[PDB]
């Protein structure tokens, strides 16, 4: 046989490159996944991740209460935290024993898989009683925030998209939903009558994952990296795997 790495007959090299290219391209087909992650960062350095993976479109919707830190199997000041919520829903509405709950997120990062179309991304960032813009009567139910997403890149390839915003002020008390649509450069509308019931089934088939990691390092090591997920850390370093035309 030809010697490795010296000719066009290195079929192991050609198949390795095809194996990667096919994964990249499958994810972008209408048969592929589109995925979103919301990361809520807490002052103790822990991170709640919520992930949803589905065909055609995907999103996540959470209340103010649901994004607060919850330590499984530990004390959580649960009575005082009921009172904190009352005081956040209406000023002076509660009887809490603290000025600032350390369970409130200090920051949110939203990441989409590279199979999203960025122009379809929509976010409803509401106040603590789940209203998008001060009063229901004057609320558009979302903002199209695609222009703010940064490309997470590895070896020159877009491995995902990130929108990050800090919540450093006492008044940053939010509810949050986000949504994006899978790329579709074709003129076959996946929600047109021929396929609309498949998209209804996709609403039931979407898989969700939720967990609190103790540190960004642990999130990088045990969540992002093992699953070949995109990520951007506090030092602006990009994680992910480049696949298109690569061995």
Q: Are 102 and 42 contacting, i.e. CB atoms less than 8 angstroms apart?
A: yes
92 binds ligand CTP (CB under 6 A): no
Stretch of 51-59, 152-160, 197-205, 213-221 lying at the interface with ligand ATP (CB under 6 A):
152-160
**Residue from the set 17, 65, 122, 154 that interacts with ligand ATP by CB under 6 A:** 154
**Residue from the set 20, 23, 30, 157 that interacts with Cl ion by CB under 5 A:** 30
Per DSSP, 223 falls in state: I
151 binds ligand ATP (CB under 6 A): no
135 binds a copy of itself (CB under 8 A): yes
* Least separation in angstroms between CB 11 and a copy of itself: 21
**C-alpha distance from residue 159 to each of 83, 176, 216, 225, 230 (Å):** 42, 24, 19, 13, 6
Stretch of 90-98, 114-122, 172-180, 201-209 lying at the interface with ligand CTP (CB under 6 A):
90-98
CB neighbourhood size of 222 (10 A): 12
Task: List the single partner that 190 binds among a copy of itself, Cl ion, ligand CTP, none, CB under 5 to 8 Å by kind.
Answer: a copy of itself
Please report which helix (H) or strand (E) contains residue 165, including its range: strand 157-166
Q: Are 114 and 32 contacting, i.e. CB atoms less than 8 angstroms apart?
A: no
Please, which residue, 206 or 232, has the CB nearer to a copy of itself? 206
* Least separation in angstroms between CB 74 and ligand CTP: 7
Please, which residue, 74 or 186, has the CB nearer to ligand CTP? 74
Stretch of 37-45, 50-58, 91-99, 230-238 lying at the interface with ligand CTP (CB under 6 A):
91-99
88 binds ligand CTP (CB under 6 A): no
Nearest CA to 55 out of 185, 195, 158, 246 is that of 195
Nearest CA to 39 out of 184, 196, 224, 189 is that of 224
The three-point CA angle 195-196-199 to 5° equals 95
Task: List the single partner that 155 binds among ligand CTP, a copy of itself, ligand ATP, none, CB under 5 to 8 Å by kind.
Answer: ligand ATP
20 Cβ contact partners less than 8 Å away, ≥ 6 residues apart? 243, 244, 245, 246, 247
- The binding site for ligand CTP (CB under 6 A) comprises 73, 75-80, 83, 95-97
């Amino acid at each position: 046989a030809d010697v490795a790495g010296t000719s066009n007959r290195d079929f192991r090299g050609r198949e390795q490159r095809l194996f990667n290219s096919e994964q990249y391209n499958y994810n972008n087909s209408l048969n592929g996944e589109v995925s979103v992650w919301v990361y809520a960062y807490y002052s103790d350095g822990s991170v709640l991740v919520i992930n949803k993976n589905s065909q055609y479109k995907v999103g996540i919707s959470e209340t103010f209460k649901a994004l607060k830190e919850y330590r499984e199997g530990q004390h959580n000041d649960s009575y005082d935290e009921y009172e904190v919520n009352q005081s956040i829903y209406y000023p002076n509405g509660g009887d809490a024993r603290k000025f600032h709950s350390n369970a409130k997120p200090r920051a949110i990062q939203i990441i989409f898989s590279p199979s999203v179309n960025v122009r379809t991304i929509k976010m409803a960032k509401g106040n603590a009683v789940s209203v998008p813009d001060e009063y229901l009567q004057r609320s558009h139910p979302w903002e199209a925030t695609g222009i703010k997403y940064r490309k997470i890149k590895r070896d020159g390839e877009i491995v995902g998209y990130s929108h990050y915003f800090e919540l450093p002020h006492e008044y940053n008390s939010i509810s949050l939903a986000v949504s994006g649509v899978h790329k579709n450069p074709s003129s076959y509308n996946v929600g047109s009558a021929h396929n609309v019931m498949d998209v209804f089934q996709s609403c039931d088939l979407a898989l969700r994952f939720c967990n609190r990691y103790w540190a960004e390092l642990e999130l990088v090591n045990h969540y992002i990296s093992p699953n070949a997920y995109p990520y951007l850390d506090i030092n602006n370093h990009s994680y992910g795997v480049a696949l298109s035309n690569r061995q």
